[PDB]
Ligand binder design. Structure first.
Ligand code: X5D
Lengths: 181, 181
């Protein structure tokens, strides 16, 4: 069942990343210059993409870690897509707390196809076991990294954060990637 | 390569159809009662989903047929999704012209995963030929129909329109499905 995660990764590139990454720096600059609080640190460049290998993808990031707190939305990106006039692509900005204080600010989200792998393992008609789910999650991330390595749209625009939970700190995991830049 | 279209279909259900179909009747009623022109026909119930087996999915439906013309958007559906606060699900309403006159009004769009199958066949690193694309497109539609047949979310909410181009009239193809209701 190689083909499942392979297709989901290509889908994620074709239907999302290649569309939004080219416009993301401009959107962040606009946020930083026009909407961001005058007294706060700039939003980091780059979309940070969370890849939990157990495909546990909560809708609310504050569920996964208290130290990750919603700050604001970027300006919306819209475009006609497959018969939908002005389909909306939206991204959320988070503050990352270290010792009750802001250590970082970045555009952050989960790779939503990992939600599909999770659900497919829960639905009997999908014919996809829980054991194949880790293997698929890993294959998804490899394929995605292979794609972005060749992608002209990835111009230091994008950072993948793969992780496994065995207390694990997600905010620390993100701060580690954020400080490397 | 059974697994490609299989996963894309499940993804389409999990990440879209199961989320929007339950709320679609309410959204259409709201449009019909509050936003729709007093003197026009009601928008049909049901989301009409175009499935061109050649995976030719233009962004603008007026490209595919002059007689299909954008009228309006439904009210937006929003929800927190995978770390994105207020991700937007948007649908477009079209008028369908027969002899220069309005014969029908419906919420209409293409199945966007067919765009992924198309693009995957164009990108060398995807390892997916044009010949496998028809087979995958067919498998996508079968899997989707299998899912919706068991789906509690599909409550006469949803109509699949599969077709192949050999002049073919898309608006007629849609009017045929629309008049069956
Ligand atoms: N028409 C229509 N189809 C939709 C819509 N939303 C999802 N779908 C389709 O549902 C399936 C599963 O969705 P996922 O969210 O798990 O995966 C997505 C995640 C990412 O997209 C975004 C977009 C905005 N913000 C975050 N991520 C790329 C990937 C593929 O996205 P698509 O190529 O658009 O197709 C998908 C896919 O086939 C919609 O609003 N309209």
């Amino acid at each position: 069942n190689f083909n499942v995660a392979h297709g989901l990764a290509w889908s994620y590139y074709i239907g999302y990343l290649r569309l939004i990454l080219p416009e993301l720096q401009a959107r962040i600059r606009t946020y930083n210059q026009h909407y961001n609080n005058l007294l706060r640190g700039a939003v980091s460049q780059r979309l940070y993409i969370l890849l939990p290998l157990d495909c546990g993808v909560p809708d609310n990031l504050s569920m996964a870690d208290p130290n990750i707190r919603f700050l604001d939305k970027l300006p919306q990106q819209t475009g006609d897509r497959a018969g939908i006039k002005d389909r909306v692509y939206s991204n959320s900005i988070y503050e990352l707390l270290e010792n009750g204080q802001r250590a970082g600010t970045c555009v952050l989200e989960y790779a939503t196809p990992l939600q599909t792998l999770f659900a497919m393992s829960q639905y009997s008609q999908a014919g996809f076991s829980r054991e194949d789910r880790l293997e698929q999650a890993k294959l998804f991330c490899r394929t995605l990294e292979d794609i972005l390595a060749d992608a002209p749209e990835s111009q230091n625009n994008c950072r993948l954060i793969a992780y496994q939970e065995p207390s694990f700190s997600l905010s620390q995991e993100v701060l580690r990637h954020l400080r490397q830049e």
